[PDB]
CSV table of C-alpha atoms in Angstrom, one decimal:
chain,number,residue,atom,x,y,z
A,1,UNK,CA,-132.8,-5.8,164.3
A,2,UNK,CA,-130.2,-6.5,162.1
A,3,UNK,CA,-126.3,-6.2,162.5
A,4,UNK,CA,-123.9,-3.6,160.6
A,5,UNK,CA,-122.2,-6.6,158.7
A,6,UNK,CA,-126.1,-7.3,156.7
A,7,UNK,CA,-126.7,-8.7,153.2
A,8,UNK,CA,-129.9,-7.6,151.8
A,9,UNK,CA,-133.4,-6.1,152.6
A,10,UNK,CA,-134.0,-4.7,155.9
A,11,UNK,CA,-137.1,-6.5,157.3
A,12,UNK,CA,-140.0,-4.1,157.3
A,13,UNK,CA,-139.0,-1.6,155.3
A,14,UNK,CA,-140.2,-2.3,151.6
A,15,UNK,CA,-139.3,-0.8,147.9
A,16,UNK,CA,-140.4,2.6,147.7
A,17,UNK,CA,-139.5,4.0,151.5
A,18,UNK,CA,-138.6,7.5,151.6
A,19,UNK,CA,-136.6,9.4,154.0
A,20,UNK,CA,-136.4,13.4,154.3
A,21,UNK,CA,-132.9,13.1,156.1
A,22,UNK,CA,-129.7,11.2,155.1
A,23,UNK,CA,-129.3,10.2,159.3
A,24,UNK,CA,-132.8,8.3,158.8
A,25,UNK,CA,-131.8,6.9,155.9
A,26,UNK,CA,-129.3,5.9,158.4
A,27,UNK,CA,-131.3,5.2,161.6
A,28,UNK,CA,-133.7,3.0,159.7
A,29,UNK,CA,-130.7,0.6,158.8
A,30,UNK,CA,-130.8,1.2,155.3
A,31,UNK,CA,-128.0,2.6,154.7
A,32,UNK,CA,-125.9,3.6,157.5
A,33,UNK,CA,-123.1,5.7,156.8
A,34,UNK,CA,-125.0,9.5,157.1
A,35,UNK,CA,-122.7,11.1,155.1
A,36,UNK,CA,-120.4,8.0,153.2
A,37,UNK,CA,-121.9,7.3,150.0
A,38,UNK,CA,-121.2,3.4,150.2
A,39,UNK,CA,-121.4,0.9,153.1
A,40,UNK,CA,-119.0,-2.0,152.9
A,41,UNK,CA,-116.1,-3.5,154.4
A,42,UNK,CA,-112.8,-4.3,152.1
A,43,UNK,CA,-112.1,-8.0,153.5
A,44,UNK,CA,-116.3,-8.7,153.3
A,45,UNK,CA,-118.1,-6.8,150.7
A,46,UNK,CA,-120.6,-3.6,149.9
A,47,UNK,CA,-123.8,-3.7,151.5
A,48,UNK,CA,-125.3,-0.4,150.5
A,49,UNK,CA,-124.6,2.6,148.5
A,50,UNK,CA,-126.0,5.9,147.8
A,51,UNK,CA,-126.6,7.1,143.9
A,52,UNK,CA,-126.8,10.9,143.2
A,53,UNK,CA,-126.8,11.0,139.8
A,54,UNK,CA,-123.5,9.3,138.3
A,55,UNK,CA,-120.6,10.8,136.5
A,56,UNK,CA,-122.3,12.0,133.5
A,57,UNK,CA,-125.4,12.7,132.0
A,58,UNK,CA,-127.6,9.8,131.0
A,59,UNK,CA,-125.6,7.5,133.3
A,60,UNK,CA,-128.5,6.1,135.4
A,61,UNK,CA,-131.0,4.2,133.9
A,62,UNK,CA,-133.0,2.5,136.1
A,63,UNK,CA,-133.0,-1.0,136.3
A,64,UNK,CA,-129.3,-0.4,135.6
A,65,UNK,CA,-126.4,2.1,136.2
A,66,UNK,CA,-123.0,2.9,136.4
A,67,UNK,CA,-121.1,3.0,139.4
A,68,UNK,CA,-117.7,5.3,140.0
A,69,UNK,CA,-115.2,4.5,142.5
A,70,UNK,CA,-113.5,6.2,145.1
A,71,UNK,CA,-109.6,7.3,145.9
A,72,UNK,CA,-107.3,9.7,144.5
A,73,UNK,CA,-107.6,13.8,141.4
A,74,UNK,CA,-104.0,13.5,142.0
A,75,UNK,CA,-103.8,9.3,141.6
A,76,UNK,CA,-104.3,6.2,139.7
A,77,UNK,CA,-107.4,4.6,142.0
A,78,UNK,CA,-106.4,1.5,143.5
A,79,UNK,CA,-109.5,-1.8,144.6
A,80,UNK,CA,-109.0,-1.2,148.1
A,81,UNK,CA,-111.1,-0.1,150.9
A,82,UNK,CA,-114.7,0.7,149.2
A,83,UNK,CA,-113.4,0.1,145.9
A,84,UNK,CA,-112.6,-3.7,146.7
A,85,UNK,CA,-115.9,-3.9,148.7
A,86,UNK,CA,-118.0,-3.5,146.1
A,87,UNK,CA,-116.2,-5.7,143.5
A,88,UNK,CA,-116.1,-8.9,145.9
A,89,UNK,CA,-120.2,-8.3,145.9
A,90,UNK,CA,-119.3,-9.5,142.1
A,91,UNK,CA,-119.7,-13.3,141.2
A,92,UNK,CA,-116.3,-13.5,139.6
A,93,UNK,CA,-112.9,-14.0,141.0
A,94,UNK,CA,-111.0,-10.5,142.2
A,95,UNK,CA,-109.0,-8.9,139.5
A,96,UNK,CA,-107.4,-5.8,140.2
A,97,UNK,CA,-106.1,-5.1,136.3
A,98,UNK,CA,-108.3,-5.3,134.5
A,99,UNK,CA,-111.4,-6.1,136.0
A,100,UNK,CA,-114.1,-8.9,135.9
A,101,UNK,CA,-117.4,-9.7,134.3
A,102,UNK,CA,-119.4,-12.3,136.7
A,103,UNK,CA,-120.0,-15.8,135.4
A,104,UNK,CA,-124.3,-15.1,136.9
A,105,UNK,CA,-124.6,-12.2,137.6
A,106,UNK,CA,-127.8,-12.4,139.5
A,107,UNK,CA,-125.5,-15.0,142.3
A,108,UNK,CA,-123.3,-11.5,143.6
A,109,UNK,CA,-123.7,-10.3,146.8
A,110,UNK,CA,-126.7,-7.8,147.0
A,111,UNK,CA,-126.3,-4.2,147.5
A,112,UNK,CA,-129.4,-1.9,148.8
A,113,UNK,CA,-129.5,1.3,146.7
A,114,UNK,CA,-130.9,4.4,148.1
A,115,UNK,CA,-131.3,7.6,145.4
A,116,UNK,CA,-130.9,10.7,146.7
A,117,UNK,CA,-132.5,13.9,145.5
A,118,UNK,CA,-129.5,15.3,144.9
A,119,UNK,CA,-129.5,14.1,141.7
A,120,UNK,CA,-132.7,14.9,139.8
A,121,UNK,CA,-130.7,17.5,137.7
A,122,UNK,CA,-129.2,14.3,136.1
A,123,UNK,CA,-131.2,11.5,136.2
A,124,UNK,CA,-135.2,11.3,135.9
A,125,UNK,CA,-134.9,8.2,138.2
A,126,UNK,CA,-133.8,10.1,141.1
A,127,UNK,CA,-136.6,10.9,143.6
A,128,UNK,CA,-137.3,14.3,143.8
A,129,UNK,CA,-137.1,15.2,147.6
A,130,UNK,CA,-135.3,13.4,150.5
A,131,UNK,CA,-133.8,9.5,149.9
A,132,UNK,CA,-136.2,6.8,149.1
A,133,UNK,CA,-134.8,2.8,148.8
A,134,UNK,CA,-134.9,1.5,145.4
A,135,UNK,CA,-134.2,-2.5,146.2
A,136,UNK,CA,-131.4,-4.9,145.4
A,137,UNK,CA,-129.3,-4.4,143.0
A,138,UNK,CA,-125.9,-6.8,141.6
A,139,UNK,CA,-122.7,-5.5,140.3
A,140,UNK,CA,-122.8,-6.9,137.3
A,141,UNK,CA,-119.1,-6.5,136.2
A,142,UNK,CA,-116.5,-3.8,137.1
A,143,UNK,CA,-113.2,-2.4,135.1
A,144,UNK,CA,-110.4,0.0,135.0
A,145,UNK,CA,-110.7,3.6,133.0
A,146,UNK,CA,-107.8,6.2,132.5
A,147,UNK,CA,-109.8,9.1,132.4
A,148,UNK,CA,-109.2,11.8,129.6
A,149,UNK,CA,-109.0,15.1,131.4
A,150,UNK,CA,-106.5,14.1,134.5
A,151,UNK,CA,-105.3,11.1,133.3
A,152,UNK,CA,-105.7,8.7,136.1
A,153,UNK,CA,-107.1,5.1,136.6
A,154,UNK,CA,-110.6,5.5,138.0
A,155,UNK,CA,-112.3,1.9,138.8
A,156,UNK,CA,-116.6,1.7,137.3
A,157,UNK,CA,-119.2,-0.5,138.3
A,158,UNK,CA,-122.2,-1.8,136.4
A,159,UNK,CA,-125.2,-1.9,138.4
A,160,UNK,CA,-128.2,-4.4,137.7
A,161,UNK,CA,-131.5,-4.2,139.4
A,162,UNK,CA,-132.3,-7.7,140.8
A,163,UNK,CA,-135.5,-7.7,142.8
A,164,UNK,CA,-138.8,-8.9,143.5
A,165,UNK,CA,-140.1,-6.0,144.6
A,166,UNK,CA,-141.1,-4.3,141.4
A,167,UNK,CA,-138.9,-0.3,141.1
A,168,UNK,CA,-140.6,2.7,142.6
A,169,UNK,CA,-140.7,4.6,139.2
A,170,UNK,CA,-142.7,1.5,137.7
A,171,UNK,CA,-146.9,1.1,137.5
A,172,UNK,CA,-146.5,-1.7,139.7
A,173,UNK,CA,-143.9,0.5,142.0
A,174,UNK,CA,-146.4,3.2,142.4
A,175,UNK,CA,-149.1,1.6,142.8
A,176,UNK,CA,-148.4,-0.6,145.6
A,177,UNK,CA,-146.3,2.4,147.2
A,178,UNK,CA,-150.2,4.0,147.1
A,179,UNK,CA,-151.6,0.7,148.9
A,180,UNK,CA,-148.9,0.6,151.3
A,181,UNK,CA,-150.1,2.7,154.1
């Protein structure tokens, strides 16, 4: 229906879907990689990712969260690979020092967002049981962090809702969740 290399919503499957299984997550298009937790290519951009939680507590707040990157924790994490993916879906010029904040941020490269249940320990957003899609969401801006307990550079993402389809956890959400069946 659509290719691997797709921007945005996949047709006919609205805000709200739920999977029980990470591979139908995966067979439904949404996002593809069954057990990679972000879907992008490095010379293109990010196309989906999966959110379990965050880092910390009180890291994901709905409409927006914070994003860690991947790589090392032996090393300083370098924008490459995923890492550079998701920071072209930014609408600012690549900077690999000390990071970007987009000029608008709602004219990035969409990214589908899928919550697992794997982290409603941690955040009251996540569902809890299976994967359900969440919408569109734009990294708003992205920048370096030596962390305090291993001392390396770790890359973060801010990550803004930006979707007509109103969010699952809202009254609109569940209700027309409710109507759709």
């Amino acid at each position: 229906i659509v290719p691997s290399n797709h921007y945005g919503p996949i047709p006919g499957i609205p805000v709200g879907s739920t999977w029980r299984f990470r591979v139908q997550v995966s067979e439904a298009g949404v996002h593809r990689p069954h057990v990679g937790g972000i879907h992008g290519r490095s010379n293109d951009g990010a196309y989906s990712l999966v959110l379990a939680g965050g880092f910390a507590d009180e890291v994901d707040r709905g409409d927006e969260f914070t994003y860690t990157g991947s790589g090392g924790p032996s090393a300083d994490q370098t924008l490459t690979n995923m890492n550079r993916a998701l920071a072209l879906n930014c609408d600012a010029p690549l900077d690999d020092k000390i990071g970007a904040e987009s000029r608008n941020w709602r004219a990035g490269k969409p990214v589908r967002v899928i919550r697992s249940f794997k982290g409603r320990k941690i955040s009251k957003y996540a569902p809890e049981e299976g994967n359900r899609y969440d919408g569109i969401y734009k990294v708003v801006k992205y920048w370096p962090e030596i962390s305090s307990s291993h001392g390396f550079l770790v890359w973060r993402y801010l990550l803004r809702r930006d979707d007509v389809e109103p969010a699952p956890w809202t009254s609109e959400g569940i209700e027309r969740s409710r109507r759709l069946c």
